[PDB]
Amino acid sequence: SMISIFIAEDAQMLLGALGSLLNLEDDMEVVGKGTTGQDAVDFVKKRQPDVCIMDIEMPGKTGLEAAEELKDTGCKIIILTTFARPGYFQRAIKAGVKGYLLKDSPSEELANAIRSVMNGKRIYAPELMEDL
């Protein structure tokens, strides 16, 4: 009924603002927060949240590396990036991420992608697909 979400973002300002923006939803709940890819692997393998919001560039293990370690878990991973750097998209689809969105997405569109991902859909930003 309530979507449990873990957020992995190394920038505390954004990690805190994302949690605040997602906790405003009636059907969502931020059950944990992390700043590294290992924090995400540790929480998802232990607590098993419905969704894991994953930044790419983080210290230790990137969100893409963390997504590869959680590929065969039942957690739906949504990647968030500011820039669409080459190979990120191909590595994201090969790791089986359910969403690949922009950090600067309006909260309305982010919550909608979380619902679509929970409905089994794959939500990828057109900007991020390395063919325009």
Binding site: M13, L21, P106
Partner: protein, 210 residues
């Protein structure tokens, strides 16, 4: 005689190719830094302003706190761009050079200058005074000379920066609080000088210590 001239172009071009590579190496470095700083801060600004809107009615005190942070982040983000110049000396006069080029082109007066000659080791105060004087010398050319050409020379000669502004129009003067007295007073207060030639058009020679 002329195989030396043709050999120096190979030297100039080879140096230019290497310079283009150093330029590009720097360009890539700034591109990474922008992505990290500005990019991050703009994403945050967008998010906090979205969250702040969501709290207008629910928690107005929290919305205010978010807006204070958005304000700060935007101000510092402009300061980062202002900082990536490496707080160089020579900027104010270089910006005034751009202003006078636009003004003279808009007035259909040919502007003759050379950017390769603009002193760098000038104090910020004396640079600002020269910018004021350069602006006024060109304003006078546009307003009064009726010139078709205006020549600006900026040279570091001995322990002074000397700016000459000349035009091919006609001098119209024969005073208190106006540009010519104003420039002379400001320059002289900074231990500089202003001289004028009104025979072949009008030529101002301003000097300031450096």
């Amino acid at each position: 005689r002329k195989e030396r001239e043709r050999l120096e172009e190979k030297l100039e071009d080879a140096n230019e190719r290497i310079a283009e590579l150093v330029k590009l190496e720097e360009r890539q470095r700034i591109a990474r830094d922008l992505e990290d700083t500005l990019g991050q801060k703009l994403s945050l600004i967008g998010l906090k302003s979205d969250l702040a809107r969501k709290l207008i009615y629910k928690d107005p005190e929290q919305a205010a706190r978010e807006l204070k942070s958005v304000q700060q982040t935007a101000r510092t983000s402009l300061n980062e761009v202002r900082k990536i110049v490496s707080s160089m000396k020579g900027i104010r006069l270089k910006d005034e050079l751009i202003n006078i080029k636009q003004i003279l082109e808009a007035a259909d007066i040919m502007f003759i200058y050379e950017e390769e000659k603009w002193p760098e080791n000038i104090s910020l105060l004396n640079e600002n005074i020269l910018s004021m004087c350069l602006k006024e010398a060109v304003t006078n050319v546009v307003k009064h000379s009726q010139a078709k050409t205006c020549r600006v020379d900026i040279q570091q000669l001995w322990k002074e920066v000397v700016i000459t502004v000349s035009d091919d129009g006609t001098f119209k003067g024969e005073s208190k609080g106006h540009g010519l007295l104003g420039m002379r007073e400001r320059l002289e207060f900074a231990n500089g000088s202003l001289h004028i030639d009104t025979e072949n058009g009008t030529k101002l020679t301003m000097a300031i210590p450096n």
